[PDB]
Design a protein around this ligand. Structure first.
Ligand SMILES: Nc1ncnc2c1ncn2[C@@H]1O[C@H](COP(=O)(O)OP(=O)(O)OP(=O)(O)O)[C@H]2OC3(O[C@H]21)C([N+](=O)[O-])=CC(=[N+]([O-])O)C=C3[N+](=O)[O-]
Ligand SMILES: CCCc1c([C@H]2CCCCN2CCN2CCOCC2)[nH]c2cc(OC(F)(F)F)ccc12
Ligand SMILES: [K+]
Length: 994
């Protein structure tokens, strides 16, 4: 029964066929249980350890690597590992990384928090029901509660199901619906049906929501829905459908890895098409075991060269360093891959109060009717100092610090503020000054009561402890508060009913004190107030009253206005049904206006400029607030979303206006709208979806467990450092200080991260493209293996992974925020940018080929047989008498291999600086700028020399030391690569445009 808020209390018991006196029979429980299931959100079907391991080994690139150790292992048992006990190491190291990477891939998951599981806190364990089999109440398990059940609740209890209320066995009933919205004010419940069947939850004044707490009182009710059909259950199935996509970089890497696989195979087929010349060999003689191993030893070597094997830890470190870096900037990033998407944001939907504004309201202006004499009108406009909730401040009539008690209309304006108020103050000594006790809007009134000191009470000898509750108190002493007609949104006002103290300071019976939205209250006003006199509400005064209201609420003051009024002859107390909010507006009719108060939720200091940063960075900002559209647009002009004289008729909509549009014109609104006023949580997801339909990367704020669906649906769900736990666990970022400028500061660091990830991603992929060249030459020309895979692994992790994890520390750009947001479908490599690194990749491939083959065909220690094409290594059998002018076994040697591995290191430390800018030269950008990078290049060398000396390592790598002079033909070959890209860089600087 999902419509139970619009049915009469008798209509619901009729629908279920239950007696409020009996409850469900045991047979009725049986049937309703099978029809509706149990009262629980579905137990999530998570993953296990056995599945996680397969996830780590389903990835293409780890699959290609996994195969590359099932071939290196074959070539270890089938290769004489007795002459070289360093043989079984090549297959063993490969597995050791797929194992370590798999281990990293899972402790990234045990800690990962599910946002849906955080909803299951608001599942209480127990609940009280009444059924047929027993006359007393039964505290049964909450999951066993079924719709149609008669259920009891009281203070402290957590509501276990969506409940329609039947009888409120207390003088009042109050509910803490803060988990839903994030608010902090208990709401009064009634029992009359709510007419609108399609009405929102804040208007379901007769419903009890599963998961919310009972603030006051005790009441009985019938259960409308259970499980996933509840209001919070309706939200779980909204996240369970949310397909959060991969970050753009993830799609680039997925597309790169998809292309890197098809590219590796492209070369493997090419090699067999070069040694399709070995297809014309005799059947005898040539050991096919020697030929097949050569191809397989080349294949396990080929795959290692292509895959950036340090990049998974290079990235997941660069991100984690910005994570700690942002935590000092108050940005708490929860999802590591989101530090990249955080910089691609183009739309930022931010709630107004708390983040854009300080949520510290205080009244700035107020006025009374001064004179009504014919069409002539006179207002008594005042102004108030003070921005905190402190009684420090004073009233100023044309800057005369006036004594407020002098004006009689000000004393009535103050009694309304103190009495028609469910908020107060209190001495705060935990932190030194004052703090709001209630609602921000109502507390601003009680503070106004203090600054006025309307009765000139003691002001000199006031201890700043019993302060702030002083002029309020002396007003509560006069009129006794009988009951309150709470604020509802149909009539947009609240009221209190008061009798006097009945002593010598009595009055004309009782009084009603009304406050609310100006238009509604003013319409119900049939009289005014001139000090203590009273006049019929006339046409001019209404126009003059409302004119100032628009000046105050629409002008550059951007004030929230409240029209205060009192009913002088209210109905007799016995004639008011206080169980029907629909009859409250009738009770608040025939009023007399007394004044209007104007308060300001002031914008934050850093907010004013952060909007302009978004303008410079091409980021559209959308405000979302509960202010009326007239004042919403007013605050947007104040912070810079709009220009003070700019038409925005089709660029700012309310909740009612947005739905009256057909789905087509809704999509076009979000493309242009920069402000929404008085929306429903159902619109935060609709706006995200429409902003997504324009391929726009959207940031969205939120606080409640009903902002959670939009937080999930958004590319970057942003939560509050004070929001409910569910909103945080459903977010990719938490503002530790509830501030908007934190978002802009986070978007800045996200670009500084990527703009440097741009380099090392291109720079490691350039070295891999370079190593693959070195293998292909050692394969076509059939040279002795110039780089064994065990050496290539050390390079692609350590001797390269420290320069790569330093380019992240590059100097941030100055125009870093003067450039528009980066596009998602921006391709990995440009046509030029690909060609550039192919030329560099081709060079470094033909230099390790040098050192590990120039150690022949022009060497001192090596053969140096430059005339005779050596090439054939294990091909030589007895073809060496006088054909090979010496021996036949130093083809394989840890002396040429240690020469290529040596030059590659020095070569890749050079490229670690060409990837410091991108187009500008080193004549302009010297290596003096990244000293973090410099002091690390030495370390990889000291490790390179550590594998060229220390006890076991040289044998492990099939490398031996160089000479104090053999570095001659290392730098003679390596260092030229700096000028190579510097040549390619002058192409773009002075002779290329876009
Ligand atoms: N359909 C609507 N009709 C009228 N008002 C709406 C409507 N929808 C929202 N609001 C108003 O907006 C204020 C809350 O919205 P806003 O300040 O933007 O955000 P929130 O406080 O809700 O918390 P959060 O945004 O999650 O951090 C409320 O204070 C008040 O009336 C409410 C309020 N209230 O009970 O909600 C009581 C009140 N008095 O005097 O009793 C004065 C308000 N006011 O002046 O704005
Ligand atoms: C980063 C370069 C590409 C690359 C991928 C791609 C291929 C397309 C599908 C998505 N993955 C990225 C997901 N992986 C899962 C395993 O943990 C690291 C992240 N998977 C690699 C594995 C590597 O193994 C190794 F151990 F060598 F790091 C190396 C590079 C890649
Ligand atoms: K999300």
């Amino acid at each position: 029964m999902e419509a139970a808020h619009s049915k009469s209390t008798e209509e619901c018991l009729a629908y279920f066929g239950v007696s409020e006196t009996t409850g469900l029979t045991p047979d009725q429980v049986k049937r309703h249980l099978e029809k509706y299931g149990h009262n629980e959100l579905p137990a999530e079907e998570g993953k296990s350890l056995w599945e996680l391991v397969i996830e780590q080994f389903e990835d293409l690139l780890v699959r290609i690597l996994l195969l590359a150790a099932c071939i290196s292992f074959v070539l270890a048992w089938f290769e004489e590992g007795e002459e070289t006990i360093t043989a079984f190491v090549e297959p063993f190291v490969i597995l050791l990384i797929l194992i370590a990477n798999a281990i990293v891939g899972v402790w990234q998951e045990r800690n990962a928090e599910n946002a849906i599981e955080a909803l299951k806190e608001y599942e209480p364990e127990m609940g009280k029901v009444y059924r047929a089999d027993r006359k007393s109440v039964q505290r049964i398990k909450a999951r066993d509660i079924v719709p149609g059940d008669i259920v009891e609740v009281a203070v402290g209890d957590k509501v276990p199901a969506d409940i329609r209320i039947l009888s409120i066995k207390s003088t009042t009933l109050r509910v803490d619906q803060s988990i839903l919205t994030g608010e902090s004010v208990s709401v009064i419940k009634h029992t009359e049906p709510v007419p609108d069947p399609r009405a929102v939850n804040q208007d379901k004044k007769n419903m009890l929501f599963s998961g919310t707490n009972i603030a006051a009182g005790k009441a009985l009710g019938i259960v409308a829905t259970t499980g996933v059909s509840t209001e919070i259950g309706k939200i779980r199935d909204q996240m369970a459908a949310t397909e959060q996509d991969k970050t753009p970089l993830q799609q680039k890497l997925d597309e790169f890895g998809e292309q890197l696989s098809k590219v590796i195979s492209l070369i493997c087929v090419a090699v067999w098409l070069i040694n399709i010349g070995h297809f014309n060999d005799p059947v005898h003689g040539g050991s096919w075991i020697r030929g097949a191993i050569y191809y397989f030893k080349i294949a396990v070597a080929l795959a290692v060269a292509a895959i950036p094997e340090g990049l998974p830890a290079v990235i997941t470190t660069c991100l984690a360093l910005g994570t700690r870096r942002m935590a000092k900037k108050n940005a708490i990033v929860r999802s590591l891959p989101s530090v990249e998407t955080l910089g691609c944001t183009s739309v930022i939907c931010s709630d107004k109060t708390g983040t854009l504004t300080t949520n510290q309201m205080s009244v700035c202006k107020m006025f009374i009717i001064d004179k009504v004499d014919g069409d002539f009108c006179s207002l008594n406009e005042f102004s108030i100092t003070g921005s905190t909730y402190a009684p420090e401040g004073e009233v100023l009539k044309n800057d005369k610090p006036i004594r407020s008690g002098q004006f009689d209309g000000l004393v009535e304006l103050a009694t309304i503020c103190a009495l028609c108020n469910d908020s107060s103050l209190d001495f705060n000594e935990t932190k030194g000054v004052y703090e709001k006790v209630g609602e921000a809007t109502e507390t601003a009134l009680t503070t106004l009561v203090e600054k006025m000191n309307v009765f000139n009470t003691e002001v000199r000898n006031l201890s700043k402890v019993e302060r702030a509750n002083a002029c309020n108190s002396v007003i509560r002493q006069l009129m006794k508060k009988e009951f309150t007609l709470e604020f509802s949104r149909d009539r947009k006002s609240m009221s209190v009913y008061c009798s006097p103290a009945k002593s010598s300071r009595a009055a004309v019976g009782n009084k009603m004190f009304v406050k609310g939205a100006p238009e509604g209250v003013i319409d119900r006003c049939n009289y005014v107030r001139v000090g203590t006199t009273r006049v019929p509400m006339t046409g001019p005064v209404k126009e003059k009253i409302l004119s100032v209201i628009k000046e105050w609420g629409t002008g550059r003051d951007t004030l929230r206005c409240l029209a205060l009024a009192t009913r002088d002859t209210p109905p007799k107390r016995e004639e008011m049904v206080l169980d029907d909010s629909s009859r409250f507006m009738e009770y608040e009719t025939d009023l007399t206006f007394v004044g209007v108060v104007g308060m300001l939720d002031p914008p934050r200091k850093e907010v004013m400029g952060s909007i302009q940063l978004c303008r410079d960075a091409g980021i559209r900002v959308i405000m979302i607030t509960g202010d009326n559209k007239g004042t919403a647009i007013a605050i947007c002009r104040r912070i810079g979303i709009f220009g003070e004289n700019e038409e925005v008729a089709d660029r700012a909509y309310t909740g009612r206006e947005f739905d009256d549009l057909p789905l087509a014109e809704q999509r076009e609104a979000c493309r242009r709208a920069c402000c929404f006023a008085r929306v429903e949580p159902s619109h935060k997801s609709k706006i995200v979806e429409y902003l997504q339909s324009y391929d726009e990367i959207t940031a969205m704020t939120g606080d409640g467990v009903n902002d959670a669906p939009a937080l999930k649906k958004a590319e970057i769900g942003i939560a509050m450092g004070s929001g409910t736990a569910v909103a945080k666990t459903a977010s990719e970022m938490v503002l530790a200080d509830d501030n908007f400028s934190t978002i802009v500061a986070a978007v800045e660091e996200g670009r500084a991260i990527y703009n440097n990830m741009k380099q090392f991603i291109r720079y490691l992929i350039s070295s891999n493209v370079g190593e693959v060249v070195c293998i292909f030459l050692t394969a076509a020309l059939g040279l002795p293996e110039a780089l064994i895979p065990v050496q290539l692994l050390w390079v692609n992790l350590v001797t390269d992974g420290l320069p790569a994890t330093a380019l992240g520390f590059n100097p941030p750009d100055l125009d870093i925020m003067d450039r528009p947001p980066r596009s998602p479908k921006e391709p990995l490599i440009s046509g030029w940018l690909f060609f550039r690194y192919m030329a560099i990749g081709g060079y470094v491939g033909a230099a390790t080929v040098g050192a590990a083959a120039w150690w022949f065909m022009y060497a001192e220690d090596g053969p140096g047989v430059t005339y005779h094409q050596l090439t054939h290594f294990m091909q030589c059998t007895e073809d060496h008498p006088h054909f090979e002018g010496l021996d036949c076994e130093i083809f394989e040697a840890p002396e040429p291999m240690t020469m290529a591995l040596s030059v590659l290191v020095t070569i890749e430390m050079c490229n670690a600086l060409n990837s410091l800018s991108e187009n500008q030269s080193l004549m302009r950008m010297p290596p003096w700028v990244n000293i973090w990078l410099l002091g690390s290049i030495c370390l990889s060398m000291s490790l390179h020399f550590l594998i060229l000396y220390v006890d076991p390592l040289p044998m492990i790598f099939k490398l031996k030391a160089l000479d104090l002079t053999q570095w001659l033909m290392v730098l003679k070959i390596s260092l030229p690569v700096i000028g190579l890209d510097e040549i390619l860089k002058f192409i773009a600087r002075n002779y290329l445009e876009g």
